[PDB]
Design an enzyme around this catalytic site. Structure first.
Site, PDB file in Angstrom:
ATOM      1  N   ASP A   1       0.558  -1.685   0.136  1.00 38.40           N
ATOM      2  CA  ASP A   1      -0.107  -0.007  -0.095  1.00 38.40           C
ATOM      3  C   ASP A   1       0.615   1.121   0.032  1.00 38.40           C
ATOM      4  O   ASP A   1       1.587   1.603   0.916  1.00 38.40           O
ATOM      5  CB  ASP A   1      -0.989   0.057   1.407  1.00 38.40           C
ATOM      6  CG  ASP A   1      -2.170   0.836   1.363  1.00 38.40           C
ATOM      7  OD1 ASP A   1      -1.860   1.927   0.616  1.00 38.40           O
ATOM      8  OD2 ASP A   1      -3.247   0.165   1.554  1.00 38.40           O
TER       9      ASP A   1
HETATM   10  O1  LIG Z   1     -11.160   1.402  -3.232  1.00 40.31           O
HETATM   11  N1  LIG Z   1     -11.861   1.249  -1.936  1.00 40.31           N
HETATM   12  O2  LIG Z   1     -11.864  -0.208  -1.263  1.00 40.31           O
HETATM   13  C1  LIG Z   1     -10.755   2.216  -0.875  1.00 40.31           C
HETATM   14  C2  LIG Z   1     -10.879   1.473   0.492  1.00 40.31           C
HETATM   15  C3  LIG Z   1      -9.716   1.885   1.138  1.00 40.31           C
HETATM   16  C4  LIG Z   1      -9.959   3.238   1.127  1.00 40.31           C
HETATM   17  S1  LIG Z   1      -9.480   4.575   2.204  1.00 40.31           S
HETATM   18  O3  LIG Z   1      -9.609   3.305   2.997  1.00 40.31           O
HETATM   19  O4  LIG Z   1      -9.765   5.322   1.764  1.00 40.31           O
HETATM   20  N2  LIG Z   1      -7.716   4.613   2.128  1.00 40.31           N
HETATM   21  C5  LIG Z   1      -7.171   5.536   2.346  1.00 40.31           C
HETATM   22  C6  LIG Z   1      -7.173   6.509   3.012  1.00 40.31           C
HETATM   23  C7  LIG Z   1      -5.610   6.891   2.727  1.00 40.31           C
HETATM   24  C8  LIG Z   1      -4.939   7.619   3.157  1.00 40.31           C
HETATM   25  C9  LIG Z   1      -5.457   7.891   4.981  1.00 40.31           C
HETATM   26  C10 LIG Z   1      -6.496   7.227   4.774  1.00 40.31           C
HETATM   27  C11 LIG Z   1      -7.028   6.589   3.734  1.00 40.31           C
HETATM   28  C12 LIG Z   1      -7.142   3.075   2.508  1.00 40.31           C
HETATM   29  C13 LIG Z   1      -6.604   2.882   1.648  1.00 40.31           C
HETATM   30  N3  LIG Z   1      -4.798   2.536   1.447  1.00 40.31           N
HETATM   31  C14 LIG Z   1      -5.560   3.359   2.751  1.00 40.31           C
HETATM   32  C15 LIG Z   1      -6.003   2.996   3.266  1.00 40.31           C
HETATM   33  N4  LIG Z   1      -6.411   2.394   4.539  1.00 40.31           N
HETATM   34  C16 LIG Z   1      -5.986   1.192   4.072  1.00 40.31           C
HETATM   35  C17 LIG Z   1      -6.720  -0.043   3.756  1.00 40.31           C
HETATM   36  C18 LIG Z   1      -6.470  -0.232   2.521  1.00 40.31           C
HETATM   37  C19 LIG Z   1      -7.495  -0.983   1.950  1.00 40.31           C
HETATM   38  C20 LIG Z   1      -8.732  -1.273   1.880  1.00 40.31           C
HETATM   39  C21 LIG Z   1      -9.328  -0.401   2.979  1.00 40.31           C
HETATM   40  C22 LIG Z   1      -8.617  -0.257   4.065  1.00 40.31           C
HETATM   41  S2  LIG Z   1      -6.137   2.346   5.782  1.00 40.31           S
HETATM   42  O5  LIG Z   1      -7.735   4.054   6.154  1.00 40.31           O
HETATM   43  O6  LIG Z   1      -6.451   1.335   6.441  1.00 40.31           O
HETATM   44  C23 LIG Z   1      -3.912   2.281   6.248  1.00 40.31           C
HETATM   45  C24 LIG Z   1      -5.116   3.181   6.393  1.00 40.31           C
HETATM   46  C25 LIG Z   1      -5.041   4.713   6.333  1.00 40.31           C
HETATM   47  C26 LIG Z   1      -3.901   5.192   7.074  1.00 40.31           C
HETATM   48  C27 LIG Z   1      -2.933   3.984   7.248  1.00 40.31           C
HETATM   49  N5  LIG Z   1      -1.735   4.829   7.888  1.00 40.31           N
HETATM   50  O7  LIG Z   1      -0.275   3.536   8.142  1.00 40.31           O
HETATM   51  O8  LIG Z   1      -1.384   6.000   8.323  1.00 40.31           O
HETATM   52  C28 LIG Z   1      -2.692   2.824   7.199  1.00 40.31           C
HETATM   53  C29 LIG Z   1      -9.778   3.962   0.113  1.00 40.31           C
HETATM   54  C30 LIG Z   1     -10.454   3.294  -1.000  1.00 40.31           C
END
Ligand SMILES: O=[N+]([O-])c1ccc(S(=O)(=O)N(Cc2ccccc2)[C@H]2CNC[C@@H]2N(Cc2ccccc2)S(=O)(=O)c2cccc([N+](=O)[O-])c2)cc1
Lengths: 116, 116
Positions: free
Chosen positions: A32
């Site tokens: 990611d």
């Molecule tokens: O298309 N999707 O299915 C989809 C799913 C999920 C998202 S999402 O949650 O907004 N969003 C984007 C995102 C990006 C930055 C900050 C927050 C969110 C997700 C996608 N990648 C980052 C983020 N997260 C992980 C995750 C990955 C896949 C599916 C769900 C969740 S998160 O939040 O756990 C992990 C999350 C946030 C922060 C951290 N960190 O280490 O700081 C770790 C977007 C799209």
């Protein structure tokens, strides 16, 4: 290796996670570039190790009960690579089954994002 | 270009987005290989503009409210390539206003994840 980006096929990898709380375990983790910190399942930690409190923001808003914070560094090894990735601290998923390799680990292994 | 990965610096990029409901606009989007579908701010769409209800998984579990789905395709332009990225549909953030390039767009521009 070069990992293609596919909406139907998530970029996963098999990585050995040493939490230094129990025995090192090979798990499947999502690669990611959107994540800052690496997320490690709480199922790899021993039941009696202390974990710091924190709050993390994501899709379904923020949360303070979903994620914790490691007290000890986490070592992560890649398939054929032998020297471990050393993360001073990383996120811990206590609810779901979440293994997420963030940019913190992707930096030490010289990982990059290429756009033709 | 080759985008380096660093926990202290998010892989952001400037992109022109056409929602086909208003004037085409420039946003700063996060290169996210962990995102299945691209997310664009609701601040792009005109005021009227039918949007579909949908469920999305992320940080604080699943959310029934945060994200909506576009009825029409979304044109996305990048600094390098002249030809636009055409997504059949993508997510719309209503609560906040995140700009997130998922693997749906990264596939059409043949983006890859390279691990030495
Ligand atoms: O298309 N999707 O299915 C989809 C799913 C999920 C998202 S999402 O949650 O907004 N969003 C984007 C995102 C990006 C930055 C900050 C927050 C969110 C997700 C996608 N990648 C980052 C983020 N997260 C992980 C995750 C990955 C896949 C599916 C769900 C969740 S998160 O939040 O756990 C992990 C999350 C946030 C922060 C951290 N960190 O280490 O700081 C770790 C977007 C799209």
């Amino acid at each position: 290796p070069v990992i293609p980006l596919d909406p139907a096929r998530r970029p996963v990898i098999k990585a050995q996670v040493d939490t230094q709380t129990s025995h090192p375990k090979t798990i499947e983790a999502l690669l990611d570039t959107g994540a800052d910190m690496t997320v490690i399942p709480i199922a790899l930690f021993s039941s009696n190790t202390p974990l710091k409190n924190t709050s993390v923001l994501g899709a379904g808003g923020q949360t303070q009960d979903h994620f914790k914070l490691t007290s000890l560094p986490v070592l992560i090894r890649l398939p054929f690579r032998t020297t471990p990735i050393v993360l001073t601290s990383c996120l811990v998923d206590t609810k779901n089954n979440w293994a997420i390799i963030g940019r913190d680990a992707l930096q030490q292994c010289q990982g990059v994002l290429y756009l033709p």
